[PDB]
Amino acid sequence: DMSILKKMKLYVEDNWNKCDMVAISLFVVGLSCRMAMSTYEAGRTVLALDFMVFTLRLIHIFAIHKQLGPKIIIVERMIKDVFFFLFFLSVWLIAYGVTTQALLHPNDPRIDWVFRRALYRPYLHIFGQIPLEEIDAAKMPDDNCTTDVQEIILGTLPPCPNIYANWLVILLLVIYLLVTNVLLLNLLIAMFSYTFQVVQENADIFWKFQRYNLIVEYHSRPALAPPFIIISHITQALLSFIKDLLERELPSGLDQKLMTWETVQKENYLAKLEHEHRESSGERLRYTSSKVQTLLRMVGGFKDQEKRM
Amino acid sequence: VNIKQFLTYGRLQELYCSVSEKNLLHTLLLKKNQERQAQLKFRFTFHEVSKVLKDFLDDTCKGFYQKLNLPDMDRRCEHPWRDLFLWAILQNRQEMANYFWAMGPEAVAAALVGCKIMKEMAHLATEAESARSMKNAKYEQFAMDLFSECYSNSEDRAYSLLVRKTCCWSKATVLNIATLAEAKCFFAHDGVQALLTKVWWGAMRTDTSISRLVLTFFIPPLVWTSLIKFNPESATFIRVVLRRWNRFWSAPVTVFMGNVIMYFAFLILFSYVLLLDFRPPPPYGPSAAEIILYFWVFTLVLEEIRQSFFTDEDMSILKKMKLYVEDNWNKCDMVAISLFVVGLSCRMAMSTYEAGRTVLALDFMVFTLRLIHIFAIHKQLGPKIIIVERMIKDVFFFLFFLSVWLIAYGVTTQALLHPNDPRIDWVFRRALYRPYLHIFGQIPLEEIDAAKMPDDNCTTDVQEIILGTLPPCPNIYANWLVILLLVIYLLVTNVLLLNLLIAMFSYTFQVVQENADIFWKFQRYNLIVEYHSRPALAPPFIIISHITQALLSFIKDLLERELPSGLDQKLMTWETVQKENYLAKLEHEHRESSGERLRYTSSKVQTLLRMVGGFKDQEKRM
Ligand SMILES: C[C@@H]1CC[C@@]2(OC1)O[C@H]1C[C@H]3[C@@H]4CC=C5C[C@@H](OCC[C@H](CO)CO[C@@H]6O[C@H](CO)[C@@H](O[C@H]7O[C@H](CO)[C@@H](O)[C@H](O)[C@H]7O)[C@H](O)[C@H]6O)CC[C@]5(C)[C@H]4CC[C@]3(C)[C@H]1[C@@H]2C
Ligand SMILES: C[C@@H]1CC[C@@]2(OC1)O[C@H]1C[C@H]3[C@@H]4CC=C5C[C@@H](OCC[C@H](CO)CO[C@@H]6O[C@H](CO)[C@@H](O[C@H]7O[C@H](CO)[C@@H](O)[C@H](O)[C@H]7O)[C@H](O)[C@H]6O)CC[C@]5(C)[C@H]4CC[C@]3(C)[C@H]1[C@@H]2C
Ligand SMILES: C[C@@H]1CC[C@@]2(OC1)O[C@H]1C[C@H]3[C@@H]4CC=C5C[C@@H](O)CC[C@]5(C)[C@H]4CC[C@]3(C)[C@H]1[C@@H]2C
Ligand SMILES: C[C@@H]1CC[C@@]2(OC1)O[C@H]1C[C@H]3[C@@H]4CC=C5C[C@@H](O)CC[C@]5(C)[C@H]4CC[C@]3(C)[C@H]1[C@@H]2C
Ligand SMILES: *[C@@H]1O[C@H](CO)[C@@H](O)[C@H](O)[C@H]1NC(C)=O
Ligand SMILES: *[C@@H]1O[C@H](CO)[C@@H](O)[C@H](O)[C@H]1NC(C)=O
Numbered sequence: 001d002m003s004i005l006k007k008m009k010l011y012v013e014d015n016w017n018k019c020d021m022v023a024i025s026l027f028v029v030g031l032s033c034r035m036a037m038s039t040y041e042a043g044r045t046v047l048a049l050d051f052m053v054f055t056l057r058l059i060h061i062f063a064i065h066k067q068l069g070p071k072i073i074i075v076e077r078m079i080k081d082v083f084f085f086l087f088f089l090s091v092w093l094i095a096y097g098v099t100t101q102a103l104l105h106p107n108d109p110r111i112d113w114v115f116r117r118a119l120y121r122p123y124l125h126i127f128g129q130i131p132l133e134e135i136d137a138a139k140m141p142d143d144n145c146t147t148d149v150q151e152i153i154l155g156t157l158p159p160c161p162n163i164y165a166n167w168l169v170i171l172l173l174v175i176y177l178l179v180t181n182v183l184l185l186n187l188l189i190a191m192f193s194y195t196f197q198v199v200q201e202n203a204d205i206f207w208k209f210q211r212y213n214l215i216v217e218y219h220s221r222p223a224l225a226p227p228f229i230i231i232s233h234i235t236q237a238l239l240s241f242i243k244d245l246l247e248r249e250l251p252s253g254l255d256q257k258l259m260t261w262e263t264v265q266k267e268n269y270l271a272k273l274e275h276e277h278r279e280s281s282g283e284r285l286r287y288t289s290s291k292v293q294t295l296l297r298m299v300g301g302f303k304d305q306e307k308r309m
Numbered sequence: 310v311n312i313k314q315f316l317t318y319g320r321l322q323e324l325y326c327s328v329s330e331k332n333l334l335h336t337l338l339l340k341k342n343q344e345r346q347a348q349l350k351f352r353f354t355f356h357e358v359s360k361v362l363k364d365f366l367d368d369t370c371k372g373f374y375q376k377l378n379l380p381d382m383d384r385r386c387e388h389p390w391r392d393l394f395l396w397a398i399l400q401n402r403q404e405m406a407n408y409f410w411a412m413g414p415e416a417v418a419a420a421l422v423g424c425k426i427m428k429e430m431a432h433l434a435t436e437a438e439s440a441r442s443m444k445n446a447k448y449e450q451f452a453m454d455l456f457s458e459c460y461s462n463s464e465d466r467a468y469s470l471l472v473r474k475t476c477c478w479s480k481a482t483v484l485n486i487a488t489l490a491e492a493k494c495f496f497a498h499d500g501v502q503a504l505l506t507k508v509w510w511g512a513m514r515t516d517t518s519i520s521r522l523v524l525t526f527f528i529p530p531l532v533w534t535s536l537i538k539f540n541p542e543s544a545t546f547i548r549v550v551l552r553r554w555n556r557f558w559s560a561p562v563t564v565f566m567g568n569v570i571m572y573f574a575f576l577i578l579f580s581y582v583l584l585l586d587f588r589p590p591p592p593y594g595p596s597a598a599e600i601i602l603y604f605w606v607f608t609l610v611l612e613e614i615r616q617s618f619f620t621d622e623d624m625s626i627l628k629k630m631k632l633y634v635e636d637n638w639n640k641c642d643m644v645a646i647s648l649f650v651v652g653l654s655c656r657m658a659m660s661t662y663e664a665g666r667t668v669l670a671l672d673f674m675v676f677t678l679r680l681i682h683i684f685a686i687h688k689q690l691g692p693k694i695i696i697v698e699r700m701i702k703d704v705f706f707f708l709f710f711l712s713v714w715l716i717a718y719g720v721t722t723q724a725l726l727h728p729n730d731p732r733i734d735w736v737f738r739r740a741l742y743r744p745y746l747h748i749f750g751q752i753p754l755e756e757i758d759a760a761k762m763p764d765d766n767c768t769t770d771v772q773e774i775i776l777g778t779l780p781p782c783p784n785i786y787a788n789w790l791v792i793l794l795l796v797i798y799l800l801v802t803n804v805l806l807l808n809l810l811i812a813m814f815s816y817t818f819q820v821v822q823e824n825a826d827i828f829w830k831f832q833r834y835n836l837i838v839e840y841h842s843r844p845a846l847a848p849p850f851i852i853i854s855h856i857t858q859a860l861l862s863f864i865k866d867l868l869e870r871e872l873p874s875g876l877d878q879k880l881m882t883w884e885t886v887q888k889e890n891y892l893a894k895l896e897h898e899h900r901e902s903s904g905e906r907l908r909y910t911s912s913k914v915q916t917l918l919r920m921v922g923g924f925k926d927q928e929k930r931m
Contacts, residue, residue, distance in 0.1 A: 190815040299921055
């Protein structure tokens, strides 16, 4: 008993369910395009992407593992620092790449190659891919290059790089390499270290809380793994047409006994708290001070009476 | 003793003249007195204390004692507790200053003024003990605690208390005094941040999701729907829809995001002009998009100038220029505009066309860097900006170490490998450029290892080497030493220095993050204050708003508001009551402390011992 729309909303709420929906949609689209001949290659591409989606689903499958689940939670938390580093790197990379593309190839109309030399190459500079053959004049090859735009567009010859102020290009490359490959990367390492230290303890508790729900799900899951699971599904459907260790209901006597036992344990726990409060140092100090004040006034009266005699 | 009747102005000046002569206040008063005598009954006149207060605050203590120039010497002070607190504060007497603050009418402003004056005198302090006491004035702590009490009490009168114009401190807003004091911890308080968030979202509700706001921004008509909830409070209907439109588009957050979107449009247009639509000199004419870009930047500079200079009605032009050039990001802005002007000028010519293109290429980088300062206000990004700004120092330390090691290794290898290359450019190349690239996995062994050196056509003659006919042959006399030095350099640089820098960044992050958050909040206050007066139209449109403002000025605030006399007095009495409650709570917590109870018990036990001993002696006598 639950609303169908509410169930759909609850399902689509989870991100891993969104990944599952993406996977099944890609499978359907790829199969449909594969069935045709004019869209065969597109279907193959979509299925290739779907394999990646399923292999990623494998992580959510392993989420219940006792040693791996907290790591999944930790990575899910690290995503935020990843995004911060992405913002910084994106700003710096846009700047450096567009500036170098303007300084080096100011007469290349090809939009694809503009975007290439502006963003793809500076991005690969991070991972040790620094092709100086296109950036340093002393290292630029004596290849057959053209300056004419027409010939450049047709792709007859590669466009010659501009070497007007190449010292500026090399200086900018040096500064970009320093900033990106040192400051940003080591800053991200520090951010991950701090985030790990602050998050791990909460990640363990969250893993336990999620483990409860995963075990609850595994309770009703049929014992047969897919693709066999169809036998169990058919059996369940046939049984439903023809016709739990957790969340059990107990007899009245046992239920009342457990309720009284809970009440007794609660009384014991409250008595222990109160006793520990009475024996606390602060409470003892307060009691001693109050009783000393009372004793002072009373013994002062007694001493006055004694002096009267 | 009735302080109101006790403290006359003559008595106040008598107190000021009777300084200890061994503290900082006496030295400052002597300096002011000598300056006044050079510019030309009582050792010091109210002019000297007024000038000292002018040095310390420069805006608040105006007319405190100059208004009447001296007032009647027998006339009682209008604000006795304020003057007493100020007097006790100028001389580092903190216990007395505290007592006077506990009696003053406006306590938050007084505490902020006190902390400002203390941190101002901390620099001028001669003795180390006095400076240490001044740095621990904890007067900002008093303001934070009292405002926490006030915020817990009402949370609606607290905002009015923050934004009201105080009567004692020359119509100065409490937030204005906190800004003057640079009380960063005060701005970090949850109440001040909540008020700033309320200002940030304008008429909209602060809980509005960012995605809904962006979607409503991109599709304007959805403002009239119920997608975003608003805070409460033919001709009528038009007025209603216009009011809703204005209440949405006047919110500071919408103005900020519009500015960000149009700055992204600027970066896109600048890149397009620089990469695809950069035409020959004006003989063939700059592109129309280039003219649009020039107009764009003109509007941006107009907005910058207006924000920096025309926001303040009364302030020295030279002082405003100094304040503007003080900020580093303003220096970056000046560099950007100067580069734009130089690049445009060189582009207008034909003999300097390429130089102009190069300068504009650099300017694009400068503007894309300006984008970070634009995003500084973001709730999740700003602290990261602060953290990076702090990391710069460790970057410099690593740079020093790397520079020393790199100079050594590079010059040694250049001497060992190419001892007969006269070309200065290639000497500097092989000495510094190549060892620098060794850090990033660029190790060209083809020029360093003889077993890997190519059978290319090389010359040994210097003449031929200089002319560039053939590349100079590398020396292979002792190449085992070159390879050993390369190995040692690779080890040191790529392992020790890099992992040391990683450790330094880790430690710096851990130590800095908490202060960076508070500094972000303190800066966020000023950014929201700036967004208050910023016109709601993002550039290049902003020119319409500028023209409208100029026309309105020729023809003719939620923060820092002034309240009616009755409400002002009510809030002052409420502040006094909250201060009394806070002090009573502190005193009660002090009485119930374990140490105080132990002291009381010990003293009373001693008294009881002696008294009961006397009683026992009396009993034994019977
Ligand atoms: C510790 C810290 C590290 C980072 C840094 O600061 C210090 O290091 C600094 C070092 C510096 C660099 C030091 C040196 C230079 C060189 C200088 O050019 C000199 C001007 C001349 C005039 O155009 C250029 O020369 C000639 O160009 C020609 C290109 O047409 C070459 O023709 C080639 O044609 C064909 C190529 O296919 C082949 O026949 C041959 O290959 C060759 O014949 C010549 O061979 C070559 O002679 C430009 C500046 C630069 C790169 C410095 C930049 C800044 C640094 C990296 C510093 C860092 C901040
Ligand atoms: C764990 C730790 C790591 C770091 C380290 O310590 C341990 O490792 C050690 C290893 C060691 C190195 C071990 C070995 C050597 C070799 C030694 O040369 C032997 C002397 C002879 C005499 O000149 C040189 O040989 C010959 O040179 C000729 C150059 O004219 C080559 O001609 C080439 O000509 C043309 C090239 O275009 C082509 O025809 C062919 O390419 C080739 O014919 C010959 O082929 C080659 O036979 C020099 C020292 C060196 C590099 C050691 C240095 C120190 C280490 C890195 C240690 C670390 C601390
Ligand atoms: C991470 C972002 C995604 C979006 C984007 O920038 C990076 O991707 C880039 C890829 C570019 C493509 C790459 C190749 C070609 C082919 C060429 O004949 C015509 C131009 C066109 C379509 C380009 C148009 C602009 C595009 C989408 C860029 C776009 C801003
Ligand atoms: C980070 C520092 C900046 C300053 C500096 O060292 C690194 O830059 C280096 C670049 C060098 C240039 C590079 C190219 C040439 C061209 C050549 O035909 C004549 C010599 C000259 C001008 C060189 C002179 C010495 C220079 C400025 C070096 C200078 C100490
Ligand atoms: C470049 O193209 C020209 C066309 O005539 C040809 O003569 C020359 O040999 C080519 N050079 C190279 C390096 O391919
Ligand atoms: C080097 O130059 C000489 C000049 O005569 C030439 O004979 C020889 O073939 C050249 N070798 C190479 C590898 O270019």
